[PDB]
Amino acid sequence: SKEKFERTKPHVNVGTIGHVDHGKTTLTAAITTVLAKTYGGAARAFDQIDNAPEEKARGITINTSHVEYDTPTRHYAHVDCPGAADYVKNMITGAAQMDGAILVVAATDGPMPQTREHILLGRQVGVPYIIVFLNKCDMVDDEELLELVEMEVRELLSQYDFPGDDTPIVRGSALKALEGDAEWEAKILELAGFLDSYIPEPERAIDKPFLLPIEDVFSISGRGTVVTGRVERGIIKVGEEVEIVGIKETQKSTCTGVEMFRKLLDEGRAGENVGVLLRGIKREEIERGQVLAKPGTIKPHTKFESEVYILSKDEGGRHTPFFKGYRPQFYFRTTDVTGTIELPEGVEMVMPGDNIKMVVTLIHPIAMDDGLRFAIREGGRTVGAGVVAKVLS
C-alpha cells in the first residue's frame, strides 16, 4: 500500500487447474522466477504461494493464492487453485473469476479423476479457454511414453466439449526452471508466449452499473475490513456509495481505497481482481458470498422461478427421479446455498436429463436478477445447470 498501480497493458485473470500433487502450485512458482529474471519484474518465491501450518506439515494447498507476473503485451493475475476433492467449494470461487485456465496433466501419471472433475466445473461455471502443461517430463527419459499422455488429454477435452486438438500442449519441468537450467527456463518462457497467443483480449462490461462478488474478506490492521474479488461489471471510484447485498440482510457502506496487489488505484475497472476497503464494517458481520452493488440496482431474494436443466449419466449428474422436498446446493457467483424445490402442477416427477422450470425457496437470501446463471451440485458432484426466470421473495 504505497506505489500507485499504472493502468497499462490489458488485465487477464489466469489460474492453474489439475489433479492433486501434479505440479499445479509449483508451476506458479516457476512462472515467477522465470519471468522476473529475464524481463526484470518483481522476484517473489515458492514458499509465499503457500505457507501456514496447513500447507507445510501436510504440503497440500487449500486457499486460492494469487500472483502478479508482468510481460510486454499483458499484465497477468494468477489464481492458484487447491486441486483436491475436499476443496471444490473455495476452488469454484477461484475458477469463476479466472478467464483462461492453465490445465496441469503430468507425463508419468496422466489424466486422473480430479482432472475430469475440475474441467467439468470449468465448463458449467465459466472457463472460456484452457492450456495444458506437462509438469514432469524429465523423470521418464523416453519419447514414446511421454507423447502417449498428450493423446489422452486431447481426448479428455474433446470428449467433455472443448477444442482438444487445437489447444497448445506444452512440456516442461517446474523444478528445473526454479534453479537455472537454460533449456527449461526457455520452455516456460514459451508458455508465457502460448498465454499471449491462444487466449485473446477478454471482453469486459464497463457500462452497466457496479457489481462485485466477495471471494474473501480481510481485516487489515490499521485501515479496516477489506473485500477482494473480480469486478463483474461497472467501475469503483474512491469515496462512492456502495450497498452490500446477500446473506443475513443488507448494509450501507462507502469505499475508502481500491487496490491491485498491494498497490493503489483510482478507478477499479471491470474484469480484474481488486481489494475494496469498506468503511465502518466489522470482520464478522460481513461474510463471504455477499456482493458489493451500487444502491438500488439489486435486491436480496429468498424465492424465485428458474429454468433448471437437470443432467443425465452421460453428461454427469443424477440417475434417479425426485419429488418436492429435495435439497441440493445452488452455486451462484461465488458461494453455495441449500433450497427446497417446489415443482409446477401437472408434473409428477423430475427425470434425469430434462428441461423444466421450478420454484426454489432458499434458506439464505442471495442477491440475484432475471438472467443469472447458476450450477446445482450435491453429494460431491454436479447435478444441473440453469437460469433465473422470475423474482418473487
Ligand X SMILES: Nc1nc2c(ncn2[C@@H]2O[C@H](COP(=O)(O)OP(=O)(O)NP(=O)(O)O)[C@@H](O)[C@H]2O)c(=O)[nH]1
Ligand Y SMILES: N[C@@H](Cc1ccccc1)C(=O)O
Partner RNA sequence: GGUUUAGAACGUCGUGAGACAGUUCGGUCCCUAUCUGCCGUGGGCGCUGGAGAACUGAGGGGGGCUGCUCCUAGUACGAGA
Residues at the site binding ligand Y, with contacts judged by CB under 6 A:
66, 216, 228, 261-262, 273-275
Helical (H) or strand (E) element with 192: helix 182-198
Alpha-carbon gap, residue 125 to 271, rounded angstroms: 16
Window 232 to 291, contacts with Mg ion (CB under 5 A):
279-280
65 part of the interface to Mg ion, by CB under 5 A: no
Residue 329 Cβ vs ligand Y, minimum distance, rounded to whole Å = 24
Residue 19 Cβ vs ligand X, minimum distance, rounded to whole Å = 7
238 part of the interface to ligand X, by CB under 6 A: no
Window 24 to 43, contacts with ligand X (CB under 6 A):
24-26
Alpha-carbon gap, residue 29 to 11, rounded angstroms: 20
Largest interatomic CA distance in the chain: 69
Contact 132, 198 (CB under 8 A): no
377 part of the interface to ligand X, by CB under 6 A: no
Instruction: Extract the C-alpha cell encoding 251.
Output: 448494509
Window 162 to 181, contacts with ligand X (CB under 6 A):
173-175
In the bound state with ligand Y, the residue whose beta carbon lies nearer, of 273 and 382, is 273
86 part of the interface to RNA, by CB under 7 A: yes
Which one of residues 112, 356, 362, 389 is an interface residue with RNA (CB under 7 A)? Answer: 112
163 part of the interface to Mg ion, by CB under 5 A: no
Span interacting with ligand X, options 15-23, 143-151, 246-254, 313-321, rule CB under 6 A:
15-23
Residue 303 Cβ vs ligand X, minimum distance, rounded to whole Å = 38
DSSP code of residue 4:
B
Contact 33, 178 (CB under 8 A): yes
Alpha-carbon gap, residue 261 to 308, rounded angstroms: 38
Site size for Mg ion, by CB under 5 A?
A: 5
Residue 77 Cβ vs ligand Y, minimum distance, rounded to whole Å = 7
Helix (H, G, I), strand (E, B) or coil at 146: helix
Instruction: Extract the C-alpha cell encoding 389.
Output: 426466470
Q: Cβ–Cβ contacts within 10 Å for residue 285, how many?
A: 11
Q: From the list RNA, ligand X, ligand Y, none, pick the one residue 109 interacts with, judged by a Cβ distance below 5 to 8 Å according to partner type.
A: RNA
DSSP code of residue 72:
S
In the bound state with ligand X, the residue whose beta carbon lies nearer, of 45 and 206, is 45
Q: Cβ–Cβ contacts within 10 Å for residue 347, how many?
A: 11
Alpha-carbon gap, residue 361 to 345, rounded angstroms: 17
Give the x/- contact pattern for RNA in 39-78, rule: CB under 7 A: -------------------xxx------------------
Q: What DSSP line would sit under 315-384, residue for residue?
A: TSS--S-B-TT---EEE-SS---BEEEEPPTT---B-SSEEEEEEEEEEEEEE--TT-EEEEE-SSSEEE
Instruction: Extract the C-alpha cell encoding 246.
Output: 446477500
Window 114 to 143, contacts with ligand X (CB under 6 A):
135-136, 138-139
Residue 362 Cβ vs Mg ion, minimum distance, rounded to whole Å = 32
**Residues contributing to the site for Mg ion (CB under 5 A):** 24-25, 61, 279-280
Q: Which residues bind ligand X (CB under 6 A)?
A: 20-26, 60-61, 82-84, 135-136, 138-139, 173-175
Which chain residues interact with RNA by CB under 7 A?
19-21, 58-60, 84-86, 108-109, 112-114
